[PDB]
Amino acid sequence: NSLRACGPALMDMLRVACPNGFN
Amino acid sequence: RGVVDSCCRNSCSFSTLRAYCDS
């Protein structure tokens, strides 16, 4: 029950997981 | 980043990733 992501993959995940971004 | 420390340098739960989003 965990996730691990680094680099562009992590950025992509935040992009879909966050309704109004992560500026 | 806080999120890199939490989700890249360590694994994180999905709810933790979500907490790093802007609101």
SS3 B12: strand
DSSP state of B10: S
Solving technique: X-ray
**Is the Cβ of B14 closer than 8 Å to some Cβ of chain A?**
yes
Which of A10, A17, A20 is facing B4, going by the closest CB pair? A10
**Is the Cβ of A11 closer than 8 Å to some Cβ of chain B?**
no
Residues with Cβ within 8 Å of B16's Cβ and at least 6 positions away in sequence, in order, are B6, B7
Distance CA A14, CA A18 (A): 6
**Is the Cβ of A1 closer than 8 Å to some Cβ of chain B?**
yes
Distance CA B20, CA B8 (A): 13
